[PDB]
Amino acid sequence: DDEEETYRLWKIRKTIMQLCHDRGYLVTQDELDQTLEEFKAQFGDKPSEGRPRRTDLTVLVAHNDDPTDQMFVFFPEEPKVGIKTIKVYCQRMQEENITRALIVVQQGMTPSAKQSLVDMAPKYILEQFLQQELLINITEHELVPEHVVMTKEEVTELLARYKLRENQLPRIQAGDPVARYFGIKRGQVVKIIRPSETAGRYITYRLVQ
DNA sequence: CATTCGCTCTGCTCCTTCTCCCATCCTCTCGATGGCTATGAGATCAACT
């Protein structure tokens, strides 16, 4: 029971570190490859005993390109997170001056909390993940090809090369599992590199909608 | 002043409802559809002078 919850927490942490590394936040190799017994050593083996508390699991990371661009990962203790908890995180983000955070929720989020993530979105970007959808890194699955988020300059070069408008690219939904993983917003473009049985390799581009 | 209570507002199911669609081309035969009589008033303007 605690042997199950500690395994879940470890897997979720591993996936979150992989996600942060793929978003380009500075993540050490040691924490990226931390084993289950090392997790038990650092945080504990009886989360029902409060060892760890899920408040202990919180992560803070900084971007490789700018040490002031920082992101939290929060693991709320309550199963169904309400607006009180979002307000607590908003306060903590305001005082630490952190604009991005991921909120990992065990069972869900209340309608009011969902709307509160929308209504603060320009200044503080809060994202919801279920813990279930973090128990496996979907980008390691064999059906999912390599996704690379493009820079604005690279999109301008793309559109200038093929002489096309953004609306002529094929789309990806902002709610797509992989778009959510990379955290890409409307109007960004993701380069996709996939093998092909007739050319050898093929690149395609999707505009987020 | 820490509840506590009551009241408004989503949003998640489970119906009922309703609207849409159902291979291509070609030949033949057969049935069915298949619509007053007549006398008056009376307005028009084509057309004679």
Residue for token pair 């699991």: A57
Q: Which domain holds residue A5?
A: 1-136
The separation, in Å, between residue A178 CA and nucleotide B22 C1' comes to 39
Resolution (A): 1.9
Structure solved using which method?
cryo-EM
Nucleotide nearest to A115 (CA to C1'): B10
Work out whether the CA dihedral A34, A74, A143, A164 comes out positive or negative. negative
User: Does strand B come within 7 Å of the CB of A115?
Assistant: yes
One domain for residues A126 and A206: no
Cβ neighbourhood burial of A199 (10 Å; 0-12, 13-18, 19+): exposed
The reply to whether A168 has its C-beta less than 7 Å from any atom of strand B is: no
A12 and A113 housed in the same domain: yes
Q: Helices A111-119 and A83-96 meet at what angle, rounded to 10?
A: 30
Q: How far apart are CA A69 and CA A121, in angstroms?
A: 16
- What's the structural domain count of chain A? 2
User: Are residue A79 and residue A105 in the same domain, yes or no?
Assistant: yes
- Contacts of residue A26, Cβ cutoff 8 Å, sequence gap at least 6: A61, A62, A63, A64
Residue A151: CA count within 13 A, CB half-sphere = 4
Of A101, A119, A136, the domain-final residue:
A136
Does residue A198 share a domain with residue A98? Answer: no
Same domain, yes or no, for A3 and A74?
Answer: yes
Q: How far apart are CA A193 and CA A201, in angstroms?
A: 7
- Distance CA(A83)–CA(A128), nearest Å, equals 13
* Terminal-residue alpha carbon distance, chain A: 42
Q: Whose structure tokens read 């979150």?
A: A16
Indicate whether A41 and A126 sit together in one domain.
yes
Same domain for A46 and A148, yes or no, is no
Within 7 Å of a protein beta carbon, the nucleotides of strand B are: 10-12
SS3 of residue A172 by DSSP: strand
Q: What are phi and psi of A152, to 5 degrees?
A: -60, -35
Residues A68 and A116 in one domain: yes
Residues A110 and A157 in one domain: no
